[PDB]
Amino acid sequence: SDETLSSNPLLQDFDFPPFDSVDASHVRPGIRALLQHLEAELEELEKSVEPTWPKLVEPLEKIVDRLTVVWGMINHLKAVKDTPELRAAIEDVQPEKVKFQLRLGQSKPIYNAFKAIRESPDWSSLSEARQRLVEAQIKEAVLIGIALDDEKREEFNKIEQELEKLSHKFSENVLDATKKFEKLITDKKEIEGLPPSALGLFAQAAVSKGHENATAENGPWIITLDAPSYLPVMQHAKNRALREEVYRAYLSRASSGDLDNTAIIDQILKLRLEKAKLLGYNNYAEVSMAMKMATVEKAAELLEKLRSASWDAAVQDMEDLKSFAKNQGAAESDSMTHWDTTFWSERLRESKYDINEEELRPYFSLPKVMDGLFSLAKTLFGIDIEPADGLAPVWNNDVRFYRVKDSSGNPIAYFYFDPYSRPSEKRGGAWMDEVVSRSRVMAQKGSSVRLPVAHMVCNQTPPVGDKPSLMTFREVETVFHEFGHALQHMLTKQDEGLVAGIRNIEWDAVELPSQFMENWCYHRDTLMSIAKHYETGETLPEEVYKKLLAARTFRAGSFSLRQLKFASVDLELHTKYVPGGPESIYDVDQRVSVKTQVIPPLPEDRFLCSFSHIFAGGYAAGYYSYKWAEVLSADAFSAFEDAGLDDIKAVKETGQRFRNTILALGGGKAPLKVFVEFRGREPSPEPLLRHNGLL
Which of the residues are catalytic? 482
The site partner of 514 among Cl ion, Zn ion, Na ion, none (C-beta below 5 to 8 Å per kind) is: Zn ion
The residue within the footprint of Cl ion, chosen from 8, 106, 494, 504 (CB under 5 A), is 106
Query: Taking CB under 5 A as the criterion, which residues in 622-641 touch Cl ion?
Result: none
Only one of the segments 108-116, 356-364, 414-422, 462-470 lies at the binding site for Cl ion (rule: CB under 5 A); that segment is: 108-116
Q: Kindly state the greatest CA–CA separation across the chain.
A: 80
567 is a contact residue toward Na ion (CB under 5 A): no
Only one of the segments 285-293, 330-338, 466-474, 479-487 lies at the binding site for Na ion (rule: CB under 5 A); that segment is: 285-293
Assess contact for 382 and 659: CB atoms under 8 A.
yes
* Residues preceding chain discontinuities in the chain with C to N over 2.5 Å: none
581 labelled as ligand-binding? no
614 labelled as ligand-binding? yes
- C-beta of 106 vs 342, nearer to Cl ion: 106
**Which whole-number Å values give the CA distances from 34 to 29, 31, 95, 469, 616, in the listed order?**
8, 5, 14, 40, 25
Residue 536's contacts (CB-CB under 8 Å, 6 or more residues apart) are: 362
Q: Burial, 446: exposed, middle or buried (Cβ in 10 Å; 0-12, 13-18, 19+)? A: exposed
Q: How far apart are CA 336 and CA 325, in angstroms?
A: 9
511 labelled as ligand-binding? yes
What secondary structure does DSSP assign to 215-272, as a single string? -SSSS-EEE-SSHHHHHHHHHH---HHHHHHHHHHHHTTTSSGGG--HHHHHHHHHHH
Only one of the segments 64-72, 422-430, 487-495, 504-512 lies at the binding site for Zn ion (rule: CB under 5 A); that segment is: 504-512
Least distance to Na ion from the beta carbon of 294, Å?
6
526 is a contact residue toward Zn ion (CB under 5 A): no
243 is a contact residue toward Na ion (CB under 5 A): no
Q: How far apart are CA 311 and CA 317, in angstroms?
A: 10
Query: Taking CB under 5 A as the criterion, which residues in 503-542 touch Na ion?
Result: none
651 is a contact residue toward Na ion (CB under 5 A): no
The residue within the footprint of Na ion, chosen from 177, 203, 271, 289 (CB under 5 A), is 289
Name beta bridge partners: 183: 223
486 is a contact residue toward Na ion (CB under 5 A): no
Assess contact for 482 and 648: CB atoms under 8 A.
no
The site partner of 188 among Na ion, Cl ion, Zn ion, none (C-beta below 5 to 8 Å per kind) is: none
Query: Taking CB under 5 A as the criterion, which residues in 505-524 touch Zn ion?
Result: 511, 514
Least distance to Zn ion from the beta carbon of 484, Å?
7
Q: How far apart are CA 662 and CA 505, in angstroms?
A: 10
Q: How far apart are CA 311 and CA 564, in angstroms?
A: 11
- C-beta of 508 vs 635, nearer to Na ion: 508
261 is a contact residue toward Zn ion (CB under 5 A): no
461 is a contact residue toward Zn ion (CB under 5 A): no
Closest residue to Cl ion, Cβ-based?
Answer: 106
Q: How far apart are CA 539 and CA 464, in angstroms?
A: 22
616 labelled as ligand-binding? yes
Only one of the segments 107-115, 229-237, 489-497, 526-534 lies at the binding site for Cl ion (rule: CB under 5 A); that segment is: 107-115
237 is a contact residue toward Na ion (CB under 5 A): no
Q: Which of 88, 57, 63 is nearest to 74 (CA)?
A: 88
571 is a contact residue toward Na ion (CB under 5 A): no
**Region class of 690: left (phi > 0), else alpha (psi between -120 and 50), else beta:** alpha
The site partner of 106 among Zn ion, Na ion, Cl ion, none (C-beta below 5 to 8 Å per kind) is: Cl ion
> Would the CA dihedral through 667, 668, 673, 674 be positive or negative?
negative
The site partner of 288 among Na ion, Cl ion, Zn ion, none (C-beta below 5 to 8 Å per kind) is: none
Q: How far apart are CA 303 and CA 285, in angstroms?
A: 15
User: Would you call 506 helix, strand, or coil by DSSP?
Assistant: coil
300 is a contact residue toward Na ion (CB under 5 A): no
Least distance to Zn ion from the beta carbon of 476, Å?
15
Query: Under the rule (CB under 5 A), what is the footprint of Na ion?
Result: 289, 292
Positions touching Zn ion (CB under 5 A) are 511, 514
Residues flagged as binding site for Zn(2+): 481, 485, 511
Q: What are the binding residues for substrate?
A: 613-619
